[PDB]
Amino acid sequence: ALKAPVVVLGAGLASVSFVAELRQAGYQGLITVVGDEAERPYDRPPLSKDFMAHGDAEKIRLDCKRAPEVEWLLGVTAQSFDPQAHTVALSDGRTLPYGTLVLATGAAPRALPTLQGATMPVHTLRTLEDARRIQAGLRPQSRLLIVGGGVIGLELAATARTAGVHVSLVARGPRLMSRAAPATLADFVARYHAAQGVDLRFERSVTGSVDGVVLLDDGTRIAADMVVVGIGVLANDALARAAGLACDDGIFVDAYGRTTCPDVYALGDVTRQRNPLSGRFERIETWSNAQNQGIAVARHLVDPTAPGYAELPWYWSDQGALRIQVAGLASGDEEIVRGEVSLDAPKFTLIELQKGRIVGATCVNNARDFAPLRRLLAVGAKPDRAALADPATDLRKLAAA
Amino acid sequence: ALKAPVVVLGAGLASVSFVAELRQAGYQGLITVVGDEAERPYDRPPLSKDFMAHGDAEKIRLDCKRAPEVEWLLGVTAQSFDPQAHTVALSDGRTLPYGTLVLATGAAPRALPTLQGATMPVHTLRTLEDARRIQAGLRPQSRLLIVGGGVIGLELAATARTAGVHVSLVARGPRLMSRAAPATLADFVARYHAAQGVDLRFERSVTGSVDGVVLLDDGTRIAADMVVVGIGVLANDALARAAGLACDDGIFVDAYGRTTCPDVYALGDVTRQRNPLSGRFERIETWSNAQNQGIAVARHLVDPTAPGYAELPWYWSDQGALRIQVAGLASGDEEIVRGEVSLDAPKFTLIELQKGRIVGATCVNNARDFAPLRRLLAVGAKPDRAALADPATDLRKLAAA
Numbered sequence: 001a002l003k004a005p006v007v008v009l010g011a012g013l014a015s016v017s018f019v020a021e022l023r024q025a026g027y028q029g030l031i032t033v034v035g036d037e038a039e040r041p042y043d044r045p046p047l048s049k050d051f052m053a054h055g056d057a058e059k060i061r062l063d064c065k066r067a068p069e070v071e072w073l074l075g076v077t078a079q080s081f082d083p084q085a086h087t088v089a090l091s092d093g094r095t096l097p098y099g100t101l102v103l104a105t106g107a108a109p110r111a112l113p114t115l116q117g118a119t120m121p122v123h124t125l126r127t128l129e130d131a132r133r134i135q136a137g138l139r140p141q142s143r144l145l146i147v148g149g150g151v152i153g154l155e156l157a158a159t160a161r162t163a164g165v166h167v168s169l170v171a172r173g174p175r176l177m178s179r180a181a182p183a184t185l186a187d188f189v190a191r192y193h194a195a196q197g198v199d200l201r202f203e204r205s206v207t208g209s210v211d212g213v214v215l216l217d218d219g220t221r222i223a224a225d226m227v228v229v230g231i232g233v234l235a236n237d238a239l240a241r242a243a244g245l246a247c248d249d250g251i252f253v254d255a256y257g258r259t260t261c262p263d264v265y266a267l268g269d270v271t272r273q274r275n276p277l278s279g280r281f282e283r284i285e286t287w288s289n290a291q292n293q294g295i296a297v298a299r300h301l302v303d304p305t306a307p308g309y310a311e312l313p314w315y316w317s318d319q320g321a322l323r324i325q326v327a328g329l330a331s332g333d334e335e336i337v338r339g340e341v342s343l344d345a346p347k348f349t350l351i352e353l354q355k356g357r358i359v360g361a362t363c364v365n366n367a368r369d370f371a372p373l374r375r376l377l378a379v380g381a382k383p384d385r386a387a388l389a390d391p392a393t394d395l396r397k398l399a400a401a
Numbered sequence: 402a403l404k405a406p407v408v409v410l411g412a413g414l415a416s417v418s419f420v421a422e423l424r425q426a427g428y429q430g431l432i433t434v435v436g437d438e439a440e441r442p443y444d445r446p447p448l449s450k451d452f453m454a455h456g457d458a459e460k461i462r463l464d465c466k467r468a469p470e471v472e473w474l475l476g477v478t479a480q481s482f483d484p485q486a487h488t489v490a491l492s493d494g495r496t497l498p499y500g501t502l503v504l505a506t507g508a509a510p511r512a513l514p515t516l517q518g519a520t521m522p523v524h525t526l527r528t529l530e531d532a533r534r535i536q537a538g539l540r541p542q543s544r545l546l547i548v549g550g551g552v553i554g555l556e557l558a559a560t561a562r563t564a565g566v567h568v569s570l571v572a573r574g575p576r577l578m579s580r581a582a583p584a585t586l587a588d589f590v591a592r593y594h595a596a597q598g599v600d601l602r603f604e605r606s607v608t609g610s611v612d613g614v615v616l617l618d619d620g621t622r623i624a625a626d627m628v629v630v631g632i633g634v635l636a637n638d639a640l641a642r643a644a645g646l647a648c649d650d651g652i653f654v655d656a657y658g659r660t661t662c663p664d665v666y667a668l669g670d671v672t673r674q675r676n677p678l679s680g681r682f683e684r685i686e687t688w689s690n691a692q693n694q695g696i697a698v699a700r701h702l703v704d705p706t707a708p709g710y711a712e713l714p715w716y717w718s719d720q721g722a723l724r725i726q727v728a729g730l731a732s733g734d735e736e737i738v739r740g741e742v743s744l745d746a747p748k749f750t751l752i753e754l755q756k757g758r759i760v761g762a763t764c765v766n767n768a769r770d771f772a773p774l775r776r777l778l779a780v781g782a783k784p785d786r787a788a789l790a791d792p793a794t795d796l797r798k799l800a801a802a
C-alpha cells in the first residue's frame with residue numbers, strides 16, 4: 001500500500017505538506033522530492049502581496065523542518081515515469097525507483113493566444129522568478145494592464161497602485177472574481193478598486209497588440225508599459241497524461257489521493273477532485289487545499305484507518321485595505337448580509353444558505369467571524385436566520401453549540 | 402494484474418461484450434456476472450424501435466455464446482463491495498470473492514422533479530419492463546406527451562405516430578438532439594417530425610400536472626393519457642461512490658478501464674472517460690461505446706501489451722423514415738453538406754471539419770457513406786473540401802487512399 005521508497009514530483013506547498021505529514025505520522029523509509037525550480041521551497045501567496053512590495057524571498061520560504069531525512073532534488077525536471085517499471089526519468093540523466101509515486105506538480109498560468117506574437121512586455125505571475133521580473137518593471141507612474149478578473153491580478157493591482165503605478169484591467173465577464181466569489185463581494189471589490197484609481201473594463205477581451213498598445217474587441221486600444229496576464233491556470237498533468245492516467249486539465253483523484261494508476265497518487269493544484277459541498281469534481285486552486293489535501297493523503301497512506309480528505313474549500317485574498325476571506329460555495333438560495341457594505345471602513349460578513357443550511361461565507365476585514373462560520377459550514381448548520389443577520393449575535397457561541 | 406476470479410456487476414451490453422472478449426482472448430479462470438434484471442441479457446436499442454412496434458423479446462437477446470463458462474446471476478442486485486476484502490455483497494445473502502471487479506452497471510433515466518407527485522401515468526424508457534409498460538398504453542388515438550428532445554423520445558414519437566397515437570413533445574432547449582448532433586441535422590429532424598404530425602413545443606419546461614393535464618412554464622397546459630420522460634440518464638455509480646472511487650455522475654476511468662481503486666475497473670454507460678476528439682472527459686451514452694470499450698478493456702486485461710481503448714464515438718438513431726448515423730463531434734469550424742436536405746426522399750451527408758481536418762460526420766439514409774467517413778475521421782484526414790462537397794466523389798476510394 002504505502003510502499004517504499006516514496007518519490008514526490010513537485011516541491012511546492014502540497015509536496016512539502018505531504019512529506020512533513022509522512023514523517024510526523026511515522027513513516028521512516030526513503031523520501032525523495034524532485035522540484036524543477038532551483039529555489040528553496042517557497043510559498044506563493046506572498047508573491048502578489050508583501051513580496052511584490054518588499055522583495056525579501058527569505059520571508060517566504062516553507063518550513064521543511066517537520067520533514068527530516070528528505071532529499072530535495074532542486075532544479076531538476078521529472079520528464080516521464082514508467083508505472084510498470086516503477087521508475088521516474090530525470091532531466092539530469094538519473095532515474096529514481098519508487099514504491100509510491102506522488103504527483104504534486106501544480107498548475108501554470110494560461111497564456112493569452114492573442115498576445116502570442118506581442119512585441120511589448122507580457123508576463124504571468126506564478127513563480128518567484130515571475131514576481132521578480134514583474135517587480136523590476138513596476139516603475140512609479142508607469143502603466144500596467146492586467147488581463148483577467150481573478151484575485152491574483154487584483155492583488156497585483158492593489159500592490160501596483162500602492163507603488164504609484166497606473167493600472168488598467170480588462171475582464172471578459174461582467175464582474176470580477178467570477179470563480180468562487182459571491183456577486184455581492186465581487187461588486188463591492190470592483191467599487192473598491194475603482195475608488196483606488198484602477199481603470200476597470202468589463203465585458204472586454206484582448207484581440208491583439210501593436211507597438212506597445214493592446215487591442216480590445218470593442219475596437220478600442222489601451223497603451224501600457226507592461227501586461228500581466230491572469231486568466232487562470234492549467235494543471236501540470238503532462239507526465240500523468242503520457243503515462244496513461246485519467247486526466248482532464250487535472251489528474252482525477254479520489255479522497256485518498258489515488259489516481260487511476262496503482263501506486264500513483266496526486267495532490268494539490270494538479271488534481272481534479274470532489275468538492276463535498278457541490279458534490280461535483282473541480283480543480284481546486286487554493287493554498288488550503290494544497291496543504292490540507294497533502295496532509296490528508298499522507299496520513300491515510302501511513303494509517304489506512306484514517307479517513308480520506310474531507311475538508312471544505314476556502315481561501316483568502318489581500319487587496320489593499322481589503323482582507324477578504326471566502327469559504328464554501330459562492331451562492332445558494334439565500335444570502336444574509338451581516339453589517340453594512342461600505343467603502344467607509346469596509347467590514348462585513350456574507351452568509352450563503354441552501355434551504356436554511358449554511359453552504360458558504362465571506363468575511364471582509366472580519367477574521368474573528370470567519371473561523372466560527374467555517375465550523376458552522378462544516379456541519380451544515382441550520383441556524384436562526386434572524387440571529388444570523390442580528391448584529392448582536394455572537395457566532396463563536398453558536399459554533400461551540 | 403488480471404487476477405482471478407473475475408466478477409462483473411451488471412449484465413448489459415458492456416458486460417456481455419467484456420466477458421466474451423475475456424474468453425476469446427484466452428482467459429480461462431472464473432467469471433461471474435451479477436445482473437439485477439431477471440431477464441436473459443438483451444439489447445436496448447430495439448426497445449424504442451422494432452420491439453416497441455412488434456413486441457417479441459426473443460429477437461432482442463444478446464449472444465452470450467462467445468462467453469462460455471460464465472455464471473450469470475440474474476435477478477440479483479450487488480449491494481456493496483469491499484475493495485480491501487475483495488468481496489461483493491449480494492441481495493440474496495451471498496458474497497462473491499474477486500481478484501478483478503468490473504463495474505458495468507449502466508445508467509438510469511433522470512426523473513422529472515415537477516412530475517414527482519403526478520396522478521397520471523408517467524414513465525421512462527430504459528428497460529424491457531419499461532417498454533412493455535409503455536407499449537401496453539400506446540392505444541390508437543390516445544395522446545402521448547414526450548418530455549425531452551433526445552433521440553430515444555424521438556424514436557418513441559415515430560413509433561407512436563406509426564401506431565396511430567397522437568404525440569406532443571416538450572423540450573427545454575430551442576432544438577432537438579442538443580447532445581452530439583449537428584444543428585443542421587437537428588433542424589431537419591424537427592421538420593420531419595412536425596410533418597408527421599408531432600406537436601413540437603420548444604423552449605418550454607414542465608412545471609407540474611393536475612388531473613391528467615401537464616403544466617408548462619409559459620402558463621399553458623397539455624392534456625395527455627401518458628407522459629414519457631426522456632431528459633437524459635444518470636450513471637448508476639452508487640456502489641463506486643460508497644466504496645471510495647472517484648465519481649461524478651459516472652465513474653472516472655482511463656483508457657484501460659481502471660478506476661481510482663486498484664483491481665476495480667468500469668465500462669460502458671456508467672463511465673466518465675476521455676473523448677479523444679475533444680480531449681475532454683465525458684459520459685458517453687452509446688451502444689458502440691458499451692461494446693467497444695468492453696472489448697478493449699478485456700483485451701488489455703488479458704494482454705497488457707494491447708493498446709488502451711481508442712475508438713472514436715458514434716451512434717445511430719432510427720426515427721420513422723429517417724435512418725440517422727452520427728460520428729465524432731457535432732461541430733467544428735466548417736460544415737460541408739453533401740446532397741440536398743429535403744423532406745422529399747431524405748438522403749444527405751454532413752461533414753464537420755476543424756482547420757481542414759474531419760472531426761465529425763452525419764449520414765441520413767446513406768449507410769454507404771458512413772463507413773468511409775468514420776475511417777477518414779479516425780485518421781484525422783484533411784481531404785479536398787470541394788471534393789468532399791462534389792457529389793461525384795467516391796468516399797470509399799478516399800478512405801482506402
Ligand SMILES: Cc1cc2nc3c(=O)[nH]c(=O)nc-3n(C[C@H](O)[C@H](O)[C@H](O)COP(=O)(O)OP(=O)(O)OC[C@H]3O[C@@H](n4cnc5c(N)ncnc54)[C@H](O)[C@@H]3O)c2cc1C
Pocket residue numbers: 009010011012013014015034035036037043044045046047048076077078079104105106107125126127152236239267268269270285286287288290314315316317318
Ligand atoms: C501569486 C499567487 C498568489 C496566491 N495567493 C493565494 C492566496 O492568497 N490564498 C490562496 O488560498 N491561494 C493562493 N495562491 C494559490 C496557491 O499558492 C496554490 O494553490 C498552491 O501554490 C498550490 O500548491 P501546489 O504544491 O499544488 O502547486 P505548486 O505551488 O504549483 O507547486 C508545484 C511545483 O511542481 C513543479 N513542477 C511541475 N512539473 C514538474 C516536473 N515535471 N518536475 C519537477 N517539478 C515540477 C512546479 O514548477 C512547481 O514548482 C496563490 C498563488 C499564486 C501564484
Ligand SMILES: Cc1cc2nc3c(=O)[nH]c(=O)nc-3n(C[C@H](O)[C@H](O)[C@H](O)COP(=O)(O)OP(=O)(O)OC[C@H]3O[C@@H](n4cnc5c(N)ncnc54)[C@H](O)[C@@H]3O)c2cc1C
Pocket residue numbers: 410411412413414415416435436437438444445446447448449477478479480505506507508526527528553637640668669670671686687688689691715716717718719
Ligand atoms: C431505449 C433505448 C434505445 C437506445 N438506442 C440506441 C441506439 O439506437 N444507438 C445507440 O448508439 N445507443 C442506443 N441506446 C443506448 C445503449 O443501449 C446504451 O449505451 C447501452 O445499453 C449501455 O450498456 P451498458 O452495459 O453500459 O449499460 P446497461 O445497458 O444499462 O446495463 C447495465 C445493467 O446493470 C444493471 N445494474 C445496475 N446496478 C446494478 C447492481 N447494483 N447490481 C446488478 N446489476 C445492476 C442495470 O440494471 C442494467 O441491467 C439506447 C438505449 C435505450 C434505453
